[PDB]
Design an enzyme around this catalytic site. Structure first.
Site, PDB file in Angstrom:
ATOM      1  N   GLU B 166      -3.038  27.683  18.123  1.00 28.47           N
ATOM      2  CA  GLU B 166      -3.810  28.205  19.250  1.00 28.47           C
ATOM      3  C   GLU B 166      -5.312  28.016  19.044  1.00 28.47           C
ATOM      4  OE1 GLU B 166      -2.618  32.127  20.150  1.00 28.47           O
ATOM      5  OE2 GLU B 166      -0.603  31.459  20.749  1.00 28.47           O
ATOM      6  N   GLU B 374       6.194  29.809  19.663  1.00 22.88           N
ATOM      7  CA  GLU B 374       6.121  31.249  19.877  1.00 22.88           C
ATOM      8  C   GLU B 374       6.561  31.568  21.298  1.00 22.88           C
ATOM      9  OE1 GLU B 374       2.058  32.059  17.202  1.00 22.88           O
ATOM     10  OE2 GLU B 374       2.413  33.265  19.009  1.00 22.88           O
TER      11      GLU B 374
HETATM   12  O1  LIG Z   1      -0.477  40.010  19.117  1.00 23.62           O
HETATM   13  P1  LIG Z   1      -0.691  39.715  20.594  1.00 23.62           P
HETATM   14  O2  LIG Z   1      -2.157  39.859  20.976  1.00 23.62           O
HETATM   15  O3  LIG Z   1       0.160  40.654  21.431  1.00 23.62           O
HETATM   16  O4  LIG Z   1      -0.167  38.186  20.860  1.00 23.62           O
HETATM   17  C1  LIG Z   1       1.037  37.807  20.197  1.00 23.62           C
HETATM   18  C2  LIG Z   1       0.867  36.523  19.490  1.00 23.62           C
HETATM   19  O5  LIG Z   1      -0.148  35.793  20.273  1.00 23.62           O
HETATM   20  C3  LIG Z   1      -0.469  34.464  19.733  1.00 23.62           C
HETATM   21  O6  LIG Z   1      -1.638  34.196  20.358  1.00 23.62           O
HETATM   22  C4  LIG Z   1      -0.720  34.437  18.220  1.00 23.62           C
HETATM   23  O7  LIG Z   1      -0.477  33.097  17.770  1.00 23.62           O
HETATM   24  C5  LIG Z   1       0.136  35.365  17.386  1.00 23.62           C
HETATM   25  O8  LIG Z   1      -0.580  35.617  16.161  1.00 23.62           O
HETATM   26  C6  LIG Z   1       0.388  36.680  18.037  1.00 23.62           C
HETATM   27  O9  LIG Z   1      -0.855  37.405  17.971  1.00 23.62           O
END
Ligand SMILES: O=P(O)(O)OC[C@H]1O[C@@H](O)[C@H](O)[C@@H](O)[C@H]1O
Ligand SMILES: O=P(O)(O)OC[C@H]1O[C@@H](O)[C@H](O)[C@@H](O)[C@H]1O
Lengths: 474, 474
Positions: B166, B374
């Site tokens: 990201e 993810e």
């Molecule tokens: O934890 P959040 O803000 O709910 O988002 C969930 C996920 O988002 C993505 O952007 C990241 O790669 C992860 O590290 C995790 O953070």
């Protein structure tokens, strides 16, 4: 701060042979599929046809003088294949070549750049009779032969060429909707003919690289950018399906030599995919165009469509507003009225921002220069006492599209030129003579041929002003 | 007529080192930028940090045993760069490498495929102190030294690698929004650091071709596909602007090595375009990846935004529904609530069809295979007596996305795998521990580490079945 139009921007106007020329059987010209089709009953509005059209074949000197008076930088016209090869196949008809040579000479003597469309829907009937025309790979050799003829003959004076005009329209209307010759409604044949047309386009772009090494060539696509009706995911998905099936299906082939995969898999699941032969991909992928030609009139808004939903709809051929109905592909998408735009009397959306959107999508996706080879407003015109045609509706339509082109240029789109449809009034294939596009009114209608006299509309002078100021004044 | 998931589809789950490992100053590990940042007052939810996280560094054997129980085909984790190079670019900490070796051996002994993320946001603080980390071209060689260190140590055993996780988030949050380290709010600096990261991505992919010739590598993009609010042309134009500035800006560079032109011209018109050195374009264009890694959670709906309109919005970091507000780029677009989709307690849209649309857009535009690195649902979970967690909301969310993936595969998208976020509960950078994503509940919260015991949620057994039936049974 808008970028200016570039110094040598081609301010143009356009026509098509069958729609303007007439002289359908003079000086050796053979039968075309439209000669036959238009005389079949019920195929055209009030039985109109191009036997005479606006008689441009005999009045081209007058017409070109009006172009020169307007200040046109470019004139886009098509060569009638049946004028040059009456049989499609055999001996050249020198009288036919001599007319376009006379026309090109006249254009150049007045400082007008010619843009030659190789194919604008009038394949010789002999080829349809001999082997089914676009349904046979023989037309690839035959189309090539005809284009190389024109390349050798005029390559020295014509810099800008268009291969196929709106392949997506004459293939779809001729083989799926049955509204164009050959009047077939067969999706399987449609995609086979479309694949052959793709190969023909690639073959002649290659030939062009040999015979006109200093020239610029590309197809001209009938581009209606798709919109989703709203942010409902199922409608955005319908928009994804519609843009890939209606637009990427052609433009990806033009630009990358490949069909889009989702549309292919869908067709393949139904046996509707075209027959590929060895060498087809190598040919399609080895034929990069110099530009994407774009004919733009309107956007299309779509929504989700169930597997048992809308298929063919009614198209407005009468100018009676509000008579067209939604069409679609069951399961994929359906058109829907866009409540945020006005429409013409033939129900065409008026969406000049749609043109900027469309130019952006093509630049963004393909990285290619764009020649706007058609854009215009088809409407009723009234002749007034004193030879006055007050076509303010058309000035405003064109003004707003030209303004959006300059914004697209500012956004970084490389627009090579703009050809308004049309220079004079001409015969609309399915709508007759009352659906007028010209800067120059032509004195005839669908009942009376009258005298075909040319009359300058209010829009003639507006566009003359645009060209004078290189678009700085609209 | 749905296609099945391929025989070796990588059913996975994912974590990130800072969110999961703990042991922040053990076994020679150096400070990362997030060790420093999260201990600054006001930067994280209730002052939570990853000093302990869920102590995966000490408990990895338990966690891997739970992965094998679940039957995971693949586990995506990140390597903590400051564990391996405590000062970023000096001598290697062998104990740091030994941890990932033990983890990888533990995974492979249970038949689980490792998927290694090189960079998940934790550049060592020494590089930030020395030269400003991602804002200096020095990071290109320092990131390459770290990547090749891992390639050589683990390339025999790891075939799937992600470069930057990201990039669009850690760069824009770190340099435009000020919500990630280094806490900067400067658009010029953001686009400079972003360009340097593009170069670092390309450089490591080049190195990867030499050190892991049989491996697969790609970046993981945080993809929120954009929707127009309706068919108003100005809103469709805002959608074109949004998809280009938010998505194409990164993915065009990853796939084609080129920035999109309309966004570039807009940045150039403000002196915000990055500084390009000679050789930059050649490097970016000569580093094709094997797949596009896609992190997907939600779509975004946009509408027009006047030049005096919305800029920065409020982001929900508390789990109080309805606290987010619109954001956008004045003159270009603003986000708007999509009335056709549900939202989580953190105001994230629930849009499984949006994943199908996103997969179709990447396949259609770039013709790349996609690894979904993810996807998941962050929500409050309740631990009930008997160590029971009934997260039917999560099962529902995951089931619907996996169904849309299968429909995407049927459309012809080449999807390599699916990594659910996350395997165990872990620290959410800005949301603390109450915003849970795990298949495995970890007993701790924002106020106490408790005993950190692992508890299988209902979704654990649902996914276990999905994997057993290769997605036939959702
Ligand atoms: O934890 P959040 O803000 O709910 O988002 C969930 C996920 O988002 C993505 O952007 C990241 O790669 C992860 O590290 C995790 O953070
Ligand atoms: O005449 P219509 O149907 O109004 O369309 C207007 C024009 O645009 C395209 O369709 C054709 O290339 C032109 O030949 C002409 O027909």
């Amino acid at each position: 701060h808008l970028k200016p139009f570039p110094p040598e921007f081609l301010w143009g106007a356009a026509s098509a042979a069958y729609q303007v020329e007439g002289a359908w059987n003079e000086d050796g010209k053979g039968l075309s599929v439209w000669d036959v089709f238009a005389k079949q009953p019920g195929r055209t509005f009030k039985g109109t046809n191009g036997d005479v059209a606006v008689d441009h074949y005999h009045r081209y000197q007058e017409d070109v003088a009006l172009m020169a008076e307007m200040g046109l930088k470019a004139y886009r016209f098509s060569v009638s294949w049946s004028r040059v090869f009456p049989d499609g196949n055999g001996a050249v008809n020198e009288k036919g070549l001599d007319f376009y040579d006379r026309l090109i000479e006249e254009l150049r003597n007045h400082g007008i750049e010619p843009i030659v469309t190789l194919y604008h829907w009038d394949v010789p009937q002999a080829l349809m009779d001999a082997y089914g025309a676009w349904e046979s790979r023989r037309i690839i050799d035959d189309f090539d032969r005809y284009a190389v003829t024109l390349f050798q003959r005029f390559g020295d004076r014509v810099k800008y060429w268009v291969t196929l005009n709106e392949q997506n329209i004459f293939i779809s209307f001729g083989y799926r909707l049955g509204l164009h010759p050959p009047g077939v409604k067969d999706m399987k044949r449609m995609y086979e003919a479309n694949h052959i047309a793709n190969l023909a386009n690639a073959k002649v772009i290659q030939s062009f690289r040999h015979y006109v090494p200093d020239g610029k060539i590309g197809p001209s696509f009938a581009y209606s950018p798709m919109y989703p009706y709203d942010s409902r995911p199922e409608n955005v998905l319908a928009f994804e399906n519609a843009e890939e099936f209606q637009n990427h299906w052609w433009m990806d082939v033009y630009a990358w030599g490949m069909y889009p995969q989702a549309a292919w898999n869908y067709l393949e699941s139904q046996g509707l995919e075209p027959t590929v032969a060895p060498g087809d991909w190598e040919l399609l992928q080895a034929a990069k165009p110099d530009f994407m030609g774009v004919n733009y009139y309107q956007t299309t808004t779509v929504e989700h469509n169930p597997p048992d939903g809308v298929g063919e709809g009614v198209m407005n051929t009468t100018g009676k507003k509000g008579t067209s109905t939604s069409s679609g592909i069951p399961g994929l998408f359906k058109t829907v009225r866009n409540p945020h735009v006005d429409t013409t009397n033939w129900d065409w959306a008026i969406d000049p921002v749609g043109l900027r959107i469309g130019l952006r999508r093509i630049a963004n996706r393909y990285q290619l220069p764009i020649l706007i080879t058609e854009n215009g407003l088809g409407e009723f015109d009234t002749l007034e006492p004193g030879d006055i045609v007050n076509d303010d509706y058309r000035i405003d339509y064109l003004r707003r599209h030209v303004q959006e082109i300059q914004r697209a240029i500012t956004d970084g789109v490389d627009v090579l030129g703009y050809c308004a449809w049309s220079f004079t009034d001409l015969l609309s294939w399915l709508n007759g003579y009352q659906k007028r596009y010209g800067f120059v009114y032509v004195n005839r209608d669908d009942e009376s041929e009258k005298d075909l006299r040319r009359i300058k509309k209010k829009s003639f002078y507006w566009y003359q002003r645009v060209i004078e100021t290189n678009g700085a004044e609209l």
